[PDB]
Amino acid sequence: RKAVIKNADMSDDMQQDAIDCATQALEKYNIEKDIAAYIKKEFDKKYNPTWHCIVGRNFGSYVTHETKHFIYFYLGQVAILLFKSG
Amino acid sequence: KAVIKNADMSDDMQQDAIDCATQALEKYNIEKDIAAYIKKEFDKKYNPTWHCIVGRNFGSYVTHETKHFIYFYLGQVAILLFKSG
Amino acid sequence: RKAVIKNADMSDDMQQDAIDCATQALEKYNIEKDIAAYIKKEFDKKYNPTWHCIVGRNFGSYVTHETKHFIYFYLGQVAILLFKS
Amino acid sequence: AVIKNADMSDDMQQDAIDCATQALEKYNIEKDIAAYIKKEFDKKYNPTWHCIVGRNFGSYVTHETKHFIYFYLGQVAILLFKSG
């Protein structure tokens, strides 16, 4: 359950909030799409739309995000991509 | 072999997405580079802003503009491509 | 990209010239502010002052224009309002 | 209210804001909001006014001196100027 931030363009509070929200997501759901949905929906509520979330063990990505609204990190063995665009 | 799992997109764009992805897999080995190629191409062809995910194991929840979303496999590799912003 | 005329009170030649001029602008600039500047200035020289141009993806407007001097159209995802007053 | 750019008298600047505040209270649609403001200024201060309301647009216009304002009301940008 170790949080490891690989790359981030985001405030420390938001970053910490992202980890907490994801920790809750993993505790509640086991399917990756459900984990991502929980995180996205929560961040749309807290910090306005529009967020997108990717959860998985094997993927590569190229996305465009608003400044100070991007985080990419692991929770244990699971990778989580969360960013705001639109 | 192209297998479309889910799609909200014009037939021309869909085919163009598959071709563009086909070129990417032939040229690159790293998924992030494959995604970069597809994203950049669709940003030029069909206006910003596109986002692309390439991989074998991931789940996602994203928001896209209508008629600008596709999710498909090229062999054993999954490709998510959508426009938002 | 693809030109789509939503509303127009303008000659067929002028409409096409507006589209051509706007097509050049998008090729020249990426910023809506700069794109609008090019189109307005171009029409001021070609068809005399005074023209006004609005470029963007999200706006509403209520304007007054001279007869046979108004066009409102899209180039790809970009809306262009051009009129003389 | 946030004034981004203005070449206009202070009394008119205040009047434009007031008129726009009224517009937002009556309408939700940008097309309707712009219509209200334009008509109002055409009645009060003679033709010809033009109004743009939205969150994403760029513009290049020519206006009569002391008859131009561009400002935000909350999350909405409003362009108002006189030409003709």
Binding site: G56, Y62, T64, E66 | G55 | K33 | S59, Y60, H63
Partner: peptide
């Protein structure tokens, strides 16, 4: 005299970034 005005809505600065999961 007539004056020219060049104004536009606020620009949200965008960034593009790559991400790749570890083996």
């Amino acid at each position: 005299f007539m004056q020219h005005a060049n104004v536009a809505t606020d620009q949200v600065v965008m960034k593009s970034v790559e991400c790749q999961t570890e083996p």
